[PDB]
């Protein structure tokens with residue numbers, strides 16, 4: 001149960017935006033130009049790496 | 051043209067608790083089989099709710115006062131004769147400012163924003179001709195017209211007017227006025243309870259979002275009275291009607307989404323310790 | 329490459345998960361043909377005063393502004409929630425158009441988080457704003473030799489204005505503590521003042537026409553869409569789809585679930601769009617990633 | 628040489644006729660943009676075309 005819960009919560013962590021405008025990459029890329037969207041992409045990358 | 055009605059009995063109203071009412075969809079995104087936690091304006095569980103009623107006899111009364119409007123209210127009307135017609139919203143309702151009027155005459159719902167000049171007792175009449183048929187005369191809610199920036203009238207329809215032993219409609223509404231918009235949520239659940247509020251769970255779906263762009267602090271309700279031959283005091287008897295008013299507060303809820311994609315259960319995060327740990 | 333070396337010893341060496349290349353791409357937009365009425369809103373002969381701004385709903389449009397490049401030149405065009413370059417590959421939901429007339433140097437106050445008479449007593453924008461603000465000089469049309477006095481603005485109020493609010497009350501403003509009682513006395517002032525426009529005024533006093541558009545981008549079904557041609561739907565293979573501006577990559581398939589009338593697409597626990605509703609055909613489709621399964625190299 | 632109010636379009640990530648059909652700057656740009664009025668030199672009474 002501990003292993004299953006750890007994997008489940010790791011999957012669930014993907015639904016939180018680490019200060020970005022949205023929690024998914026597709027919406028950010030569709031709404032913003034590359035040079036501006038790179039900031040939000042970096043924020044999400046850092047959060048998921050942590 | 052409107053005249054204040056006389057001969058109404060005086061007594062303070064009663065109080066009731068809405069068990070699990072006032073839950074509505076937070077947005078327009080489909081979800082299923084998930085436990086979504088969101089925070090918004092909501093009606094707290096087991097909150098005090100004033101109970102007004104319109105009934106005939108020395109107990110004849112209408113009870114359509116100017117209730118305050120505090121950052122969104124919860125309205126639930128139950129009846130069987132379509133007595134409840136609509137509401138009016140505004141600050142002072144004395145033609146100095148703009149006010150929103152929502153009402154269906156008998157054949158089409160009318161929404162207007164204008165500098166209306168209301169009177170103290172707004173109502174709509176219904177006439178019961180005995181030889182043959184209810185005509186619904188006496189449209190005297192307000193007294194003057196003005197610039198009337200906003201305007202919307204639906205397509206003509208028809209509806210019954212008598213419908214008279216237990217209530218059968220239980221029509222609920224939710225009003226919110228945020229950032230210049232007037233969101234409205236509605237639901238229609240048939241019931242058969244006699245003279246109370248049926249406890250249960252109901253999820254409300256959005257209906258309309260009007261860009262009214264005005265300031266609202268107070269509101270009323272329009273009632274329809276029917277007189278045929280009973281003698282200002284011309285026998286304005288009311289068949290049967292009651293409605294309940296609650297006030298929204300900023301709370302946190304734990305909505306549950308069904309397999310189909312419907313909200314079936316909610317949990318308050320501030321009701322009691324058990325719900326807090328839930 | 330994974331080991332970052334040119335020598336590999338024995339082992340199992342679980343490498344990166346395999347992927348599938350999405351060789352094709354589709355675009356799916358609703359059936360909108362008639363162009364948007366740019367002439368009605370931009371080329372209007374008359375414009376309302378700033379305090380009583382006029383709001384107009386726009387729907388069933390093809391938001392192609394390429395026809396405007398020869399008509400009008402805009403001195404200010406700022407977008408907040410969406411990049412200007414990506415304005416052609418999107419579908420908008422609930423656009424609205426607001427228009428009024430202000431002075432030459434008060435255009436800077438039409439922006440979120442700004443102060444001034446315009447941003448306090450006439451027209452306030454929300455802090456969280458998505459849309460664009462367009463203004464252009466109109467000295468040729470809104471000025472006369474004798475002075476144009478048709479435009480009025482509010483000068484006094486008892487409090488600030490909430491976002492997207494209107495107030496047309498003309499009650500006498502009281503500046504002191506003595507009651508005014510309707511009489512325009514010493515401390516009593518008319519709340520709204522008049523503008524003075526002349527053809528020979530300075531550039532900071534020439535009239536400026538302002539058009540503001542507010543919309544929601546992804547949520548809810550959309551009605552105003554840009555100029556992108558729609559292609560045939562492709563099923564059961566990897567494609568760079570584009571459903572009303574939502575660009576991704578996946579494999580489409582039939583879905584048993586049905587959406588409510590006011591819903592467009594759904595999200596899973598990961599908050600990603602797994603199911604969408606096609607705009608051309610009222611159908612439900614499911615999106616799944618093209619890569620699934622691990623691969624390891626024994627050597 | 629451009630119109631007076633079109634100097635705003637000379638910037639990365641900008642739209643308009645100048646930044647679509649005439650002259651476009653890259654998204655990753657390093658440098659400076661300089662503009663100044665030249666009405667005294669580039670205008671004539673009969674119209675400069």
Ligand SMILES: CCCCC/C=C\C/C=C\CCCCCCCC(=O)O
Pocket residue numbers: 443444445
């Ligand atoms: C004489 C000032 C002494 C210093 C006072 C200190 C702080 C107050 C700050 C700003 C007030 C002056 C600027 C007013 C801007 C109004 C803008 C407008 O009208 O469009």
Ligand SMILES: CCCCC/C=C\C/C=C\CCCCCCCC(=O)O
Pocket residue numbers: 364365366369386391393396397400401402405415420423425460462541552642643644
């Ligand atoms: C009447 C518009 C209704 C809303 C349409 C929705 C989205 C389209 C967005 C913007 C179009 C108007 C601005 C055009 C800018 C051109 C700039 C230039 O020429 O320098």
Ligand SMILES: *[C@@H]1O[C@H](CO)[C@@H](O)[C@H](O)[C@H]1NC(C)=O
Pocket residue numbers: 052053054170
């Ligand atoms: C109703 O009452 C108000 C205040 O009591 C009064 O001003 C008004 O004139 C009354 N209505 C009529 C028709 O006289």
Ligand SMILES: *[C@@H]1O[C@H](CO)[C@@H](O)[C@H](O)[C@H]1NC(C)=O
Pocket residue numbers: 065066098
């Ligand atoms: C709330 O309801 C209770 C029970 O009916 C009552 O005793 C109390 O006075 C009510 N409070 C208010 C503010 O109405």
Ligand SMILES: *[C@@H]1O[C@H](CO)[C@@H](O)[C@H](O)[C@H]1NC(C)=O
Pocket residue numbers: 066067068096
């Ligand atoms: C509110 O009313 C309901 C139904 O009558 C009841 O179950 C509940 O205990 C009441 N709550 C309070 C605090 O009186």
Ligand SMILES: *[C@@H]1O[C@H](CO)[C@@H](O)[C@H](O)[C@H]1NC(C)=O
Pocket residue numbers: 155156157158160186203
């Ligand atoms: C209600 O208003 C509509 C127009 O908005 C009108 O046609 C209708 O006649 C009115 N109702 C009655 C009973 O006259």
Ligand SMILES: *[C@@H]1O[C@H](CO)[C@@H](O)[C@H](O)[C@H]1NC(C)=O
Pocket residue numbers: 179181182183
């Ligand atoms: C019913 O009769 C009255 C009186 O003759 C008449 O005014 C009314 O129009 C009639 N209504 C119908 C539905 O026949």
Ligand SMILES: *[C@@H]1O[C@H](CO)[C@@H](O)[C@H](O)[C@H]1NC(C)=O
Pocket residue numbers: 196197380496
């Ligand atoms: C509303 O109408 C009055 C005339 O009754 C007029 O003086 C005023 O300017 C109008 N205001 C608007 C916003 O239309």
Ligand SMILES: *[C@@H]1O[C@H](CO)[C@@H](O)[C@H](O)[C@H]1NC(C)=O
Pocket residue numbers: 309310
């Ligand atoms: C909800 O899901 C059940 C599961 O099969 C289904 O039988 C039912 O019809 C669904 N509800 C509606 C309103 O279709």
Ligand SMILES: *[C@@H]1O[C@H](CO)[C@@H](O)[C@H](O)[C@H]1NC(C)=O
Pocket residue numbers: 359608609
């Ligand atoms: C939309 O257009 C497509 C192609 O022109 C057509 O196949 C489809 O039937 C249209 N949709 C409707 C609702 O007419």
Ligand SMILES: *[C@@H]1O[C@H](CO)[C@@H](O)[C@H](O)[C@H]1NC(C)=O
Pocket residue numbers: 367371
């Ligand atoms: C558009 O505006 C220009 C100048 O403002 C005018 O010359 C032209 O006639 C207008 N066209 C239409 C269709 O209104």
Ligand SMILES: *[C@@H]1O[C@H](CO)[C@@H](O)[C@H](O)[C@H]1NC(C)=O
Pocket residue numbers: 398
């Ligand atoms: C563009 O505008 C100029 C104004 O001088 C006019 O002569 C020309 O015909 C226009 N062309 C188009 C395609 O609108």
Ligand SMILES: *[C@@H]1O[C@H](CO)[C@@H](O)[C@H](O)[C@H]1NC(C)=O
Pocket residue numbers: 141265266267487488489490
């Ligand atoms: C809305 O109206 C009330 C009147 O009850 C007033 O006190 C309040 O200041 C108004 N709102 C704003 C933002 O001025």
